[PDB]
C-alpha cells in the first residue's frame, strides 16, 4: 500500500 | 518570446534539483569497464533503480507547488511517473556523447545484460528516437518535471491542481524549444509526442524485471512498491 513511498514523501 | 525573470528563476531551480543525480559518466564508465554476468547486471540494475527512485522523490518534492497537493494525489503522481522517469534518464545517459566506439560497446553490453529479446528492440528504439531530438540538459530536466506533473495519471482526484503546476513548466519548455531549435517549429510537439511513447514502457515494466535471464529475481522493498514486482 505504498508504505515506503508515503514515508519518503512525508519525512522532513 | 524570451524567458521572463520568473521563468529564468524556475529554470535554474529545476536544473539545480535535476543536477543532484548520478553523473552519466559514472553509470557508463561502470558498464564499459568490464562485462558482467546476467546475475551481476540484475543486481547492478536493482541498485541503480532503487537509487533513481530515492533521488526522484527528492526532485519531485522540490517541484513548485508539489507539497501543496493532496497527499493521495502526491503518491499517485510519484507512482505513476517513477518508471517513465527512469527510462527518460536512461535515454539521456544513452545519448550522451562518448569517445569513438564506446556507445556501440555500451549498446552491446546492455543488449547482453540479461534483459529478454522482446524488450531489447523497443527500449533502444525509444532511446534512439529521443536521441534524434538532440535535447539539451534543460529540456531533459523540464521534460522529467512535466512527466511527473501529469494531470491525466490514474487515481488523480484533483486534475486542475496538477494542471496548474504543469502549465508553467510546459510554457518554459516551449520557449526553450523555440530558442534552442528555431529551425524546427515541431521540436516542442515532438517532445510531447515522445511522452506518449514513454507510457508504453509501463505496460511491461514489471515483465522486463521478471523475465531477466537469472534464476532468482530479488528486489528491494522500495522497488517492489514502485515496479509492481514481488
Ligand atoms: O540515472 C539513473 O539513476 C539511472 C538509473 C538506472 C539506469 O538504468 C541502468 C540500466 C543498466 C543496468 C545494468 C545492466 C545494463 C542496463 N540501463 C537501462 C535499463 C535497462 C533495462 C531496464 Cl528494465 C531499465 C533500465 N538502460 C540504460 C541505458 C544506458 F545508457 C545506461 F548507461 C544504462 C541503462 C540508468 F541508466 C540510469
Q: Does B226 touch chain A (CB under 8 A)?
A: yes
- Ligand 1 centroid to Cα of residue B163, in Å, is 30
Q: Given an 8 Å threshold on Cβ–Cβ distance, is A5 in contact with B71? A: no
Domains and CATH numbers, chain B: 1-230 (1.10.565.10)
Tell me, in Å, the resolution of the deposited structure: 1.9
How big is the CA angle at B81 (ends B210 and B77), to the nearest 5 degrees? 125
Cell of B104: 556501440
Among B41, B35, B18, which residue's Cα sits nearest to residue B89?
Answer: B18
Query: Which residues make Cβ contacts (< 8 Å) with residue B122, sequence separation at least 6?
Result: B200
- Closest approach atom of ligand 1 to CA B205: 23
DSSP annotation string for chain B: -PPPHHHHHHHHHHHHHHTTSPPHHHHHHHHHH----HHHHHHHHHHHHHHHHHHHHHHHHHSTTGGGS-HHHHHHHHHHHHHHHHHHHHHHHHTS--STTHHHHHHHHHHTSS--HHHHHHHHHHHHHHHHT---HHHHHHHHHHHHT-TT-TT-S-HHHHHHHHHHHHHHHHHHHHHH-TT-TTHHHHHHHHHHHHHHHHHSHHHHHHTSSSS-----HHHHHHHT--
A contact set with B (CB within 8 A): 2-6, 8-10
- Contacts of A2 by beta carbon, 8 Å cutoff, 6+ apart: B75, B79, B225
Q: Whose CA is nearest to atom 8 of ligand 1?
A: B90
Inspect the interface and report whether the beta carbons of B75 and A8 lie closer than 8 Å.
no
> How far apart (Å, rounded) are the C-alpha atoms in residues B198 and B147?
9
The reply, when asked if residue B205 is annotated as ligand binding, is: yes
- Which one of B57, B221, B226 has the shortest CB-CB distance to A9? B57
Print burial letters for B106-135: b (CB count within 10 Å at least 16), e (below 16): beebbeebbbeeebbeebbebbeebbebeb
- Experimentally, the structure was elucidated by X-ray
Question: How far apart are the CA of B41 and the centre of ligand 1, in A?
Answer: 10
- Assess whether the C-beta atom of B60 lies below 6 angstroms from ligand 1: no
Question: How many pairs of residues across A and B have Cβ atoms under 8 Å apart?
Answer: 25
Hey, are the CB atoms on B225 and A8 less than 8 Å from each other?
A: no
**Is residue B91 less than 8 Å (CB to CB) from chain A?**
no
Give distance in angstroms: CA of B46 to centre of ligand 1: 10
- Nearest one of A8, A5, A11, A9 to B83, comparing CA atoms: A5
Amino acid at each position: 500500500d505504498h508504505q515506503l513511498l508515503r514515508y519518503l514523501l512525508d519525512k522532513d | 518570446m524570451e524567458l521572463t525573470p520568473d521563468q529564468q528563476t524556475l529554470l535554474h531551480f529545476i536544473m539545480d534539483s535535476y543536477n543532484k543525480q548520478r553523473m552519466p559518466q559514472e553509470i557508463t564508465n561502470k558498464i564499459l569497464k568490464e562485462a558482467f554476468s546476467a546475475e551481476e547486471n540484475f543486481l547492478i540494475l536493482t541498485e541503480m533503480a532503487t537509487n533513481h527512485v530515492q533521488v526522484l522523490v527528492e526532485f519531485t518534492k522540490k517541484l513548485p507547488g508539489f507539497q501543496t497537493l493532496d497527499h493521495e494525489d502526491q503518491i499517485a503522481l510519484l507512482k505513476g511517473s517513477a518508471v517513465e522517469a527512469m527510462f527518460l534518464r536512461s535515454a539521456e545517459i544513452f545519448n550522451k556523447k562518448l569517445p569513438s566506439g564506446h556507445s556501440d560497446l555500451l549498446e552491446a553490453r546492455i543488449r547482453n545484460s540479461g534483459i529478454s529479446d522482446e524488450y531489447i528492440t523497443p527500449m533502444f528504439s525509444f532511446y534512439k528516437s529521443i536521441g534524434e531530438l538532440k535535447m539539451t540538459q534543460e529540456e531533459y530536466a523540464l521534460l522529467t518535471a512535466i512527466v511527473i506533473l501529469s494531470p491525466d495519471r490514474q487515481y488523480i482526484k484533483d486534475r486542475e491542481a496538477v494542471e496548474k503546476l504543469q502549465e508553467p513548466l510546459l510554457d518554459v519548455l516551449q520557449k526553450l524549444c523555440k530558442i534552442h531549435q528555431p529551425e524546427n517549429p515541431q521540436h516542442f510537439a515532438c517532445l510531447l509526442g515522445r511522452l506518449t511513447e514513454l507510457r508504453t514502457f509501463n505496460h511491461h515494466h514489471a515483465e522486463m524485471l521478471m523475465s531477466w535471464r537469472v534464476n532468482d529475481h530479488k528486489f528491494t522493498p522500495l522497488l517492489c512498491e514502485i515496479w509492481d514486482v514481488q
